[PDB]
């Protein structure tokens, strides 16, 4: 739910409950994004290590 500051004390969690992490404060797309972005990069980071790993041996 969307309200304002005196209201929240009141405001119920189960009305304040659609969710995914970090995004109980979010609606899909931004979150999708932030997932995606980690995931891939962190593959390439691993890949980078791995690239270098053959060159050594």
């Amino acid at each position: 739910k969307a309200l304002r500051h005196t209201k929240a004390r009141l405001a119920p969690r189960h009305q304040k409950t659609t969710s995914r992490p970090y995004g109980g404060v979010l609606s899909h797309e931004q979150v999708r994004d932030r997932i995606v972005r980690a995931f891939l990069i962190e593959e390439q980071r691993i890949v980078k290590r791995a690239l270098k790993a053959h060159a050594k041996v």
């Binding site: 995606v36 972005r37 891939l40 990069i41 593959e43 390439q44």
Partner: peptide, 9 residues
């Protein structure tokens, strides 16, 4: 860029 990567994969 991400898309580059994404797509790349």
């Amino acid at each position: 860029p991400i898309r580059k990567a994404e797509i790349e994969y």
